[PDB]
Ligand binder design. Structure first.
Ligand SMILES: [O-][n+]1cc(-c2c(-n3cnnn3)ccc(Cl)c2F)ccc1[C@@H](CC1CC1)n1cc(-c2cncs2)cn1
Length: 236
């Protein structure tokens, strides 16, 4: 996260850190708890992942340094990537992880609701991106989970900033015109979380962008409301 600040324990309890363990263990992507055995993340995260065997899901983590050889994690039973996914910039950047067992929810590990039926025309004004990613283009994964409030941008404005890409209704864009706050490398797959009537909703999945926090180049997010039927179908 560029231009963000440190979170505290329990502040974003649906946020998980997905680790790969091949050829060495490291943070791969963010993700969001949406059910006791279900994580929602980005399909691009699994580029070069040979199978679910090498994945570890860690929840209730504030600092990456908390993760040691005895830290509990969830195994991944199945990776479900959208059938039309080809690359993040073309859309369909969405994946479900089915865990091998059920999260018992606690103060530090909680689900986030999907955008609610009948809320299609809600204007979200309280949206936050979170993650352990770079603070600038040439950086490193951060120890403490970071947060930044970022305003949504209309798809018309977003298309004007990305005339070489097709910005569809299945994407949502977010950023300041002057830049300075954005997701960056290592934040992909995590949530764009928006609070409405004091309830948090998973509005976006961090997906792609031209650079990090550049002027007039918003971050692009998978528009979760447009995949609710797909999510319900896979998780039934
Ligand atoms: O995470 N992440 C974020 C963005 C991104 C950007 N960025 C544009 N240029 N950089 N970021 C801007 C706006 C928005 Cl919304 C973004 F989602 C693009 C790509 C990635 C991921 C894809 C990898 C997982 C397949 N990635 C992770 C790493 C590293 C991990 N460990 C050390 S490096 C490098 N790439």
């Amino acid at each position: 996260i560029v231009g963000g600040t440190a979170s505290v324990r329990g502040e974003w309890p649906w946020q998980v850190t997905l680790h790969t363990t091949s050829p060495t263990q490291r943070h791969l992507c963010g993700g969001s708890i949406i059910g006791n055995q279900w994580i929602l993340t980005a399909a691009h995260c699994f580029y070069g992942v040979e199978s679910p065997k090498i994945l570890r899901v860690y929840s209730g983590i504030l600092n990456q340094s908390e993760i040691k050889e005895d830290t509990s994690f969830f195994g991944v039973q199945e990776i479900i990537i959208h059938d039309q996914y080809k690359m993040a910039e073309s859309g369909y950047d969405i994946a479900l992880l089915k865990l091998e067992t059920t999260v018992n929810y606690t103060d530090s590990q909680r689900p986030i609701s999907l955008p609610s039926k009948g809320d299609r025309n809600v204007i979200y004004t309280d949206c936050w991106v979170t993650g352990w990613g770079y603070r600038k283009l040439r950086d490193k994964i951060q120890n403490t989970l970071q947060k930044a409030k970022i305003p949504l941008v209309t798809n018309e404005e977003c298309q004007k900033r990305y005339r070489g890409h097709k910005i569809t209704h299945k994407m949502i864009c977010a950023g300041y015109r002057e830049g300075g706050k954005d997701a960056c490398k290592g934040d992909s797959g995590g949530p764009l979380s928006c609070k409405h009537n004091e309830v948090w909703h998973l509005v976006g999945i961090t997906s792609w962008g031209e650079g990090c926090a550049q002027r007039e180049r918003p971050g692009v997010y998978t528009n979760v409301v447009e995949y609710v039927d797909w999510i319900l179908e896979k998780t039934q």
